[PDB]
């Protein structure tokens, strides 16, 4: 499974690599992103492709002994990824899985006011004889939000449905979160408040049936 | 220099033989090594096998019982072919290009050393969901604006109702339109369907300038333009 | 004896040379045992059949260990003869090992002697002045082995990496057996290199000189050994402390006509029995560290056929 | 619990004396060979 990782933005980090070597060993670093496309940092120890910064390095066994640290200089916020660490060694045969996956987090990122936007039910979905609101959460950082909804006054706490909080380009966050409700009870309520808690500030949106 | 590009179903039945194919653009395919990974949801990322230059293939001792890799040669193309797919095979596939290395530690007479390999090139990737389910197509629902900040900037989106399979993909104005753009990760409601948003945020002076949000699901085959308007 | 391989994981070729034994042993007190495990060369136990196996020496003889302070590397010795007595030196560089001396001189002792325990390869030996020189009985007869002597000794290095460890385990009261722990670091092969142009120089003034008994235009050739005991197809010595055999098909394995270095793979013993009395056998404590020595290979023991064939050995 | 052991037996191996002969010390006098004396 995945371990975690904290390090400052701009200082130095060494990744430590799991079940260390017993003989010579050409090991790899790939970095991945969830659901992009995995990029390798390091095929061989001290080798690396071109068109990777000078910023990633790995650690070369010149004598036995020597532990495999991915060392990042200069950490931002886009190194922030999943690391595999695949391991080859004399000792043993063919390794199939590769190292345990690293969760590099970059700290102190400035924290960002959620920018949100309430939908109401539109004409060609109410149509269906359905509604569904829609509570949409961009640019906000850190990715810990709670989402409430009002009618009124009185909290819904029923047909909510919200996603977990997932990175867009911005390096920010983005989030939604649906209301399923019957148009009549939409109509009956005079208007619909949604609520996003973000660390100790809260913002709400409300809209009503025109 | 190497471009890849994956293309599969996104869905199959189970016990079926999952198919998926990685085009490549950059060279040719019988001078560099190949092969396929798999990320599934919750556990990390599984090497599952691999095929050579010279026409050889390796697999994953736990999927080798299921598992087959080819190469084509008059297309610039590798297939994968999986057979008695179940629950677990449910994954987003990379195919990558490969070097052998060989790491040497002693006397080349002896033995004393061992081929490594590392992957440089990666593709994109093709998600692949296994269920028993059917497909089922997008329903698209204009969201009008609010007449929502003070004045200028504004939102406006489109609403992907339930369907099934992810993904979907979302443009505007056949791609003419990319400024504040937003589109948000899809949820699985209770019915086990997926319903995404896409968001636009546009000035309030350019408010008609006809914003057409085309959406595509490819299980579907499913290609729907939708217009908005307050 | 519970055995099993130590998973070189690579193919599986050299897992047996090299083996981990584990077994129930007596401690010091009588009513109370122990169960220990150790690292066994390929060439110290034979199977029962599972993996059941059981030390060679116990269907043959009995067996004891070296006390591990006496050091088998061998010293100069002086051999001397009492009062009304003297030794005889021949001092001919020609000498054929037999016949009259015309040149003798006389001595009390004799010059510091090495007793290297070696096989088709004299190590650390007495080098020829000039020339190299053959001696046998009846170099006629093919079952009288050949001395070669050397005057340009050709070095060795022989070499065994493999890290290994001592552990100390209490047999009886007083009594504390020393087994292989582990290997620390790579699993490699012990092997001696030599110098590859060094040997054809030497082999070459070897043969000048065996076609002064046998013709210039008589072709012989070499090979490696015609079989018997292990002691006698290979090359046996004693490094560091523990016991080398080497195969030596890569030194004798050329055919010489009328007008960079190579390596030999070893082996490693420490079960070993006396070469005259079988039903005594010694194990060598093993060596910490890796193993590594360097000799002077000045002599020869080989052996005719009945052109001509000539195959080392001599046990 | 009870238990024991001698306390030569993780340390050396154990012999009774005979119980014949006797360790009480008798006079002992010390010479030297023809040609050598004592002073
Ligand atoms: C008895 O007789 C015996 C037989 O005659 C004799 O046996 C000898 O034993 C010794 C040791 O016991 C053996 O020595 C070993 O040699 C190994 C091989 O070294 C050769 O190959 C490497 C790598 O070559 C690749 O890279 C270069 C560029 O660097 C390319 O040009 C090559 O083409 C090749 O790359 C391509 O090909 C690969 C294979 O197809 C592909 O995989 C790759 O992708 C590419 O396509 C060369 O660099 C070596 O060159 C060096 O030596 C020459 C002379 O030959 C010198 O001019 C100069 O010094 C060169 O630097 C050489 O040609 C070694 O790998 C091995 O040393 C490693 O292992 C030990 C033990 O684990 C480590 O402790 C040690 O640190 C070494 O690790 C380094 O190297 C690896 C490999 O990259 C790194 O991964 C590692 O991190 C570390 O790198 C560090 O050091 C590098 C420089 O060394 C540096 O560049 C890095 O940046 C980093 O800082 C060991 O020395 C010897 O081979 C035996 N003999 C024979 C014939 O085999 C025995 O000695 C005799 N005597 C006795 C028993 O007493
Ligand atoms: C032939 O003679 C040579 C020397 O005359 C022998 O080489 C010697 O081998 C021994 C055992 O390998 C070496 O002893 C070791 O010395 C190192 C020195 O650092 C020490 O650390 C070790 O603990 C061990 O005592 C010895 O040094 C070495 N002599 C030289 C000059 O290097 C060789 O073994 C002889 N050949 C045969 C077959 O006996
Ligand atoms: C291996 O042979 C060489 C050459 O005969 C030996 O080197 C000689 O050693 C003697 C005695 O130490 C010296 O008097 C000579 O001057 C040396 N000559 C040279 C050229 O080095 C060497 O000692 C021999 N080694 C062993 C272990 O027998
Ligand atoms: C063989 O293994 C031993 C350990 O089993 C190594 O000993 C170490 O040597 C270094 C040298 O600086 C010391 O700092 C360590 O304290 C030693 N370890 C112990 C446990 O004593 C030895 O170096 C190894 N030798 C080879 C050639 O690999
Ligand atoms: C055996 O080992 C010795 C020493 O490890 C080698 O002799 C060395 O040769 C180099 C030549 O490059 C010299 O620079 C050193 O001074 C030599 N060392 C000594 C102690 O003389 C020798 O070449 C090796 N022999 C073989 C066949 O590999
Ligand atoms: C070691 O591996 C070899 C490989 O064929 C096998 O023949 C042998 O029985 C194995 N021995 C043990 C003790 O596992
Ligand atoms: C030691 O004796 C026990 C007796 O129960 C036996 O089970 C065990 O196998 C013995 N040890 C070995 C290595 O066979
Ligand atoms: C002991 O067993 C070995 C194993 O092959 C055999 O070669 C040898 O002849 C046996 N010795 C006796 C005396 O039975
Ligand atoms: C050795 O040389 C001497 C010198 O004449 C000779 O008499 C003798 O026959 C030779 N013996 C052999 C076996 O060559
Ligand atoms: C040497 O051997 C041959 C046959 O092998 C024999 O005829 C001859 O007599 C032997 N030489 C001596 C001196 O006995
Ligand atoms: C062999 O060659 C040598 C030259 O060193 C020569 O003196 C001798 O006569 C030759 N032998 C024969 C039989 O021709
Ligand atoms: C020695 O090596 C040669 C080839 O290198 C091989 O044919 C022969 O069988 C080997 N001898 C032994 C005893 O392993
Ligand atoms: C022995 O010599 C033959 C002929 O040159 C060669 O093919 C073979 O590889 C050699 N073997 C060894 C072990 O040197
Ligand atoms: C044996 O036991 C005694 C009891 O204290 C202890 O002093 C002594 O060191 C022990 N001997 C050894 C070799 O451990």
């Known amino acids: 499974y995945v371990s975690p990782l904290s390090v400052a933005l701009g200082e130095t980090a060494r990744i430590s690599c799991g079940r260390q070597a017993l003989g010579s060993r050409a090991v790899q670093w790939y970095q991945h992103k969830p659901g992009q496309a995995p990029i390798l940092l390091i095929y061989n120890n001290q080798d690396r492709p071109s068109g990777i910064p000078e910023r990633f390095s790995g650690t070369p066994d010149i004598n036995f002994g020597t532990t495999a640290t991915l060392t990042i200089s200069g950490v931002e916020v886009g190194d922030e990824a999943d690391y595999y660490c695949h391991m080859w060694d004399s000792r043993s045969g063919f390794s199939w899985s590769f190292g345990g996956a690293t969760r590099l987090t970059v700290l102190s990122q400035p924290k960002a006011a959620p920018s949100v936007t309430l939908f109401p039910p539109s004409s060609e979905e109410l149509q269906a004889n359905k509604a569904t609101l829609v509570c949409l959460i961009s640019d906000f950082y850190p990715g810990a939000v709670t989402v409430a909804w009002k009618a009124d006054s009185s909290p819904v706490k029923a047909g909510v449905e919200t996603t977990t909080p997932s990175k867009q380009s911005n390096n920010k966050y983005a989030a939604s979160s649906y209301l399923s409700l019957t148009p009549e009870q939409w109509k009956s309520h005079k208007s619909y408040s949604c609520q996003v808690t973000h660390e100790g500030s809260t913002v709400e949106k409300t809209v009503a049936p025109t | 220099q190497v471009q890849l590009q994956e293309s599969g179903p996104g869905l199959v039945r189970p016990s079926e033989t999952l198919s998926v194919t990685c085009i490549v653009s950059?060279?040719?395919?019988?001078?560099?090594?190949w092969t396929w990974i798999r990320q599934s949801p919750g556990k990390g990322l599984e090497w599952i096998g691999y095929?050579?230059?010279?026409?050889?293939?390796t697999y994953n001792p736990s999927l080798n019982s299921r598992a087959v890799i080819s190469r084509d040669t008059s297309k610039n193309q590798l297939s994968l072919q999986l057979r008695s797919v179940t629950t677990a095979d449910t994954a987003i596939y990379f195919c990558?290009?490969?070097?052998?290395?060989?790491?040497?530690?002693?006397?080349?007479?002896?033995?004393?050393?061992?081929?490594?390999?590392?992957?440089?090139?990666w593709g994109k990737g093709t998600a692949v969901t296994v269920s028993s389910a059917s497909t089922k197509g997008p329903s698209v629902f204009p969201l009008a604006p609010s007449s929502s900040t003070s004045g200028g900037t504004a939102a406006l989106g489109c609403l992907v109702k339930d369907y099934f399979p992810e993904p979907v993909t979302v443009s505007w104005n056949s791609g003419a339109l990319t400024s504040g753009v937003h589109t948000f990760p899809a949820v699985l409601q209770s019915s086990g369907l997926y319903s995404l948003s896409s968001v636009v945020t546009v000035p309030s002076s350019s408010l008609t300038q006809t914003y057409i949000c085309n959406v595509n699901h490819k299980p579907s085959n499913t290609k729907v333009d939708k217009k908005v308007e307050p | 004896l519970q055995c099993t391989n130590v998973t070189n994981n690579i193919t599986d070729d050299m897992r047996g040379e090299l083996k981990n034994c584990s077994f129930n042993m007596t401690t010091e007190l009588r009513d109370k045992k122990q169960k220990v495990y150790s690292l066994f060369y390929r060439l110290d136990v034979v199977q029962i059949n599972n993996k059941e196996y059981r030390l060679i020496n116990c269907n043959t003889s009995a067996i004891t260990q070296a006390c591990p302070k006496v050091s088998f590397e061998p010293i100069p010795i002086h051999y001397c003869a009492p009062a009304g007595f003297a030794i005889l030196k021949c001092k001919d560089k020609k000498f054929n090992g037999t016949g009259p001396c015309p040149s003798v001189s006389t001595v009390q002792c004799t010059h510091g002697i090495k007793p290297v325990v070696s096989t088709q390869l004299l190590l650390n030996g007495s080098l020829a002045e000039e020339e190299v020189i053959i001696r046998s009985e009846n170099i006629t007869n093919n079952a009288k082995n050949i001395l070669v002597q050397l005057n340009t000794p050709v070095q060795i290095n022989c070499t065994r990496p493999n890290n290994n460890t001592v552990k100390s385990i209490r047999i009886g009261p007083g009594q504390w057996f020393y087994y292989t722990g582990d290997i620390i670091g790579d699993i490699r092969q012990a092997h001696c290199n030599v110098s590859k142009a060094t040997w054809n120089e030497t082999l070459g003034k070897v043969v000048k000189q065996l076609r002064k008994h046998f013709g210039n235009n008589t072709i012989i050739r070499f090979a490696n050994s015609s079989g018997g005991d292990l002691e006698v197809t290979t090359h046996s010595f004693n490094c560091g402390g523990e016991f080398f055999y080497c195969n030596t098909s890569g030194l004798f394995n050329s055919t010489w006509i009328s007008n960079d270095s190579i390596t030999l793979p070893c082996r490693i013993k420490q079960i070993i029995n006396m070469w005259q009395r079988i039903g005594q056998a010694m194990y060598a404590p093993p060596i910490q560290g890796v193993i590594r020595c360097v000799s002077n290979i000045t002599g020869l023991i080989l052996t005719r056929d009945g052109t001509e064939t000539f195959r080392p050995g001599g046990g | 619990n009870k238990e024991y052991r001698l306390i030569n037996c993780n340390t050396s191996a154990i012999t009774q004396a005979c119980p014949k002969v006797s360790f009480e010390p008798i006079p002992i006098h010390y010479c030297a060979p023809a040609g050598f004396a004592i002073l």
């Open positions: 990558a290009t490969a070097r052998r290395g060989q790491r040497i530690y002693g006397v080349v007479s002896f033995g004393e050393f061992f081929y490594y390999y590392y992957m440089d090139v």
């Open positions: 950059g060279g040719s395919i019988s001078n560099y090594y």
């Open positions: 095929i050579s230059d010279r026409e050889t293939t």
